[PDB]
Amino acid sequence: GYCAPYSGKVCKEYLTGQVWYSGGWKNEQVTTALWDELISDLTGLCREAAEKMLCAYAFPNCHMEGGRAVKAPLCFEDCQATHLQFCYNDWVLIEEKKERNMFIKSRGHFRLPNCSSLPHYNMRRPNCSYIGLTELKESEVSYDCRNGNGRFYMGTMNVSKSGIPCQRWDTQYPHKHFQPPLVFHQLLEGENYCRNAGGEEPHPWCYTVDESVRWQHCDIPMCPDYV
Ligand SMILES: *[C@@H]1O[C@H](CO)[C@@H](O[C@@H]2O[C@H](CO)[C@@H](O)[C@H](O)[C@H]2NC(C)=O)[C@H](O)[C@H]1NC(C)=O
Ligand SMILES: CCCCCC/C=C/CCCCCCCC(=O)O
C-alpha cells in the first residue's frame, strides 16, 4: 500500500512492523544481491549491524501521521555506531575502493549513508527506522565485575590495569579520538570510566591521561556467576 507489512524474503527476519511502499521489487533484488556480495563477506558485530542497517535502509519503516504515510530514514545513532565503530574497517575499505572506481557490483542505486544527514532518534511515532545498535543489553549489564569482555560493563572503574587515570570520553586531550562514538549508551554518561562499547576488545578499556599510553585495558574481575 503506502504502509504495509513487508512482503519479501531477504529481510523477513529483520523487519517486524509496517514498511514503506511506493519499485519494492527493485529493492528486494538489490538487497538480495548485496546479501550475497557484501553481507556474506562481513563477520561478527559488523555483520550483525550491517544486516539490520541494510534491511532498514532498503525497507524503511512506515507510519501514519493523520492521513499521510511517512517514510522513516535511518537513525543518526545507528548509522554512527555502524560507520564509526562496528563496521569502520569494512566501511573505510569500501570507500577507498570507490575512490578508485571499484564499486560493489550489486549495489544498484544503494549508497553508504552520510550519518550526519540523518535524524537523531526521538515521540510516540519515530522520526527514523530505529534499530537500537547503541543500546545496552540489560541482562548483560554489570557494575562491579565484567561479563566476558565487558561490552556492557557500566561500572565506575576509572584507571587502567597499570593504574593510569582514564581520560574522559568527552574530552580530546591528551588523546584525540573519533571512535568509539559517544552515541553508545555505555558512553552517554561514561565520565572517565572503563568501557568496551565497541565489544571488540577482550576487556573494558579507556584512553589514558598518560601522553605516552594512548589506550589501555582496565583490570576488572569476572562476575562470579558469568558463564
Ligand atoms: C555529510 O552531511 C553533513 C551534514 O549536512 C555535511 O556537513 C555539511 O557540509 C557542508 C559542506 O559541503 C557545510 O557547508 C555544512 O555546514 C555542513 N552541515 C552540517 C550540518 O554539518 C557533510 O559535508 C556531509 N559529508 C560529505 C562527505 O558530503
Ligand atoms: C560495511 C558497510 C556495511 C553497510 C552499512 C549499512 C549501510 C546500508 C546502506 C546500503 C549500502 C550498500 C553498499 C553501497 C556501496 C556504495 O556506497 O558504493
| 92 and 35 in a common domain | yes
Q: Is residue 124 part of a domain?
A: no
Which residue pairs, CB below 8 angstroms and at least 24 apart, start in 64-68? 64/3, 65/125
Residues 145 and 58 grouped into a single domain: no
Distance CA 94, CA 149 (A): 29
Q: For ligand 2, atom 4, which residue shows the shortest CA distance?
A: 50
The residue type at 141: V
Same-domain status, 81 and 171: no
Whether 71 is covered by a domain: the verdict is: yes
Q: Residues 214, 152: one domain? A: yes
For the chain, what is the HEC assignment?
CCEECCCCCCCCCCCCCCEECCCHHHHHHHHHHHHHHCHHHCCHHHHHHHHHHHHHHHCCEEEEECCEEEEECCCHHHHHHHHHHHCHHHHHHHHHHHHCCCCCCCCCCCCCCCHHHCCCCCCCCCCCCCCCCCCCCHHHCECCCECCCCCCECCCCCECCCCCEECCCCCCCCCCCCCCCCCCHHHHCCCCCCECCCCCCCCCEEEECCCCCCEEECCCCECCCCC
Q: At what angle do helices 44-58 and 24-37 cross, to 10 degrees?
A: 170
Residue where a domain stops, chosen among 67, 88, 117: 117
CATH of the domain at 39: 1.10.2000.10
In a domain, 224, yes or no: yes
CA distances from 95 to 91, 103, 139 (A): 6, 9, 36
Whether ligand 2 lies within 6 angstroms of the CB of 168 is answered as no
Residues 10 and 111 both lie in one domain: yes
With CA atoms as reference, report the closest residue to 195 among 182, 176, 214, 211. Answer: 182
Is 154 found in the same domain as 57?
A: no
- One domain for residues 40 and 97: yes
State the number of CA atoms in the 13 A half-sphere of 13 facing the CB.
4
- Please check whether residue 186 is in contact with residue 138, taking contact to mean a CB–CB distance below 8 angstroms: no
Domain end call among 117, 150, 177: 117
Ligand 1: centre distance to CA 103 (Å)? 23
128 domain-assigned: no
In angstroms, this model's resolution equals 1.8
Within 8 A by CB and 6+ apart from 116, the residues are: 76
Domain tally for the chain?
Answer: 2
Q: Are residues 87 and 18 in the same domain?
A: yes
What gap in Å lies between CA 54 and CA 102, rounded to an integer?
Answer: 20
The verdict on 19 and 79 lying in the same domain is: yes
| Atom 7 in ligand 1: residue holding the nearest Cα | 116
- 111 touches ligand 1 (CB under 6 Å): no
| Distance from Cα 18 to the centre of ligand 2, integer Å | 23
Experimental technique behind these coordinates: X-ray
Substitution candidate for ligand 2 out of 46, 92, 100, 110 with most atoms within 8 A of CB:
110
In short, whether 117's Cβ falls inside 6 Å of ligand 1 is yes
Are 107 and 158 within one domain? Answer: no
Is 152 part of a structural domain of the chain?
yes
Rounded CA separation 169/112 (Å) = 27
Evaluate whether 129 touches 74 at the Cβ level (below 8 Å): yes
Considering Cα of 167, then 148, then 223, then 139, what sign does the dihedral take? positive
Instruction: Verify whether ligand 1 is closer than 6 Å to residue 156 (CB atom).
Output: no
Q: How many CA atoms lie within 13 A of 65 on its CB side?
A: 9
Evaluate whether residue 129 is within a structural domain: no
Structural domain including 85 reads: 3-117
For ligand 1, atom 19: residue with the closest CA = 116
Torsion of CA 76, 81, 85, 88, to 10 degrees: -50
The cell 589514558 sits on which residue?
Answer: 208
- Measured from the Cβ of residue 26, the count of other Cβ atoms closer than 10 Å reads 11
Residues 6+ apart with CB under 8 A from 211: 174
